[PDB]
Amino acid sequence: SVQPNFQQDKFLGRWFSAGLASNSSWLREKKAALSMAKSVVAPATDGGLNLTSTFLRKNQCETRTMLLQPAGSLGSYSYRSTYSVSVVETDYDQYALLYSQGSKGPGEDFRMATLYSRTQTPRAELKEKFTAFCKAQGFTEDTIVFLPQTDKCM
Template sequence: MAAPQTLWVGLALLGVLGGLRTRARAHVSLQPNFQQDKFLGRWFTAGLASNSNWFREKKDALSTCSSVVAPREGGGLNLTSTFLRKDHCETRTLLLLPAGPPGCYSYTSPHWGGTQNVSVVGTDYVEYALLYTEGTKGHGQDFRMATLYSRTQTPRAEVKEKFANFTKAQGFTEDTIVFLPKTDKCLEEHK
């Protein structure tokens, strides 16, 4: 079984960002006319919601991480995230492959195996992005996560409210939603 910090890496990297099932596509829409080139650049993971038991147990110990979304030669995106783990900074990169219409990506989870699908469900490109991830982990357990990306560590109250409303519409409850505290650690690598 993966260490809790290793699982956080997977969650944080998602956060920015597995297959979306047909039932999920029925109630999670994509950003209309998604423009990948505008989505590129530095983001902070400012909010998370998940149905994972591990997440519920560890959410109070999590803090903001920094991620850079960059195009990958040959297609897809590299999502490179830097976060605090055991008092030192760690960087991980995920390869997000196009998986359907623009704004849909998939990746293979290095910790859980299987494919996770990520959808950009809303963004204004300059301030925030809302992402929804779904797939399986471990022994076929359903996994769902919503992520709030912000171009700054302190998103406006209206953006946080938009994220809270989105997560509740996806069936997440208050105890499964967290706005991550701002930190000065491990954020310099992606300036």
């Protein structure tokens, strides 16, 4: 589902990409070949969000920005294949669990769960929450991974 009573303003700011689960080997491999620094969530010039991710690739700092357009309900967004992105659960000041699925085109084959943490190294219980969520969503244990982090690029 989507986080009930989702408050976008409390979801803004700095998050760390701590955990990932995907049914795409290509995407898993791509993400694992990098080191995550931080992500920043900010309101876009429309009712959606800009998600700016900073990471290290071959010792080079890089950034990518993703526009998450509103999808007609709070906590639900769209990214253009087209993908649905949902904030399924969050307490705003510790963690957020995101879920993405293709909604149009070949991307429909694609599913991804993400654990965002307000701290770069998340508590063990946060990791358990994520694993439990991924298992509930039909991800195999081997696809549930915690991404390499970097202190650089901050």
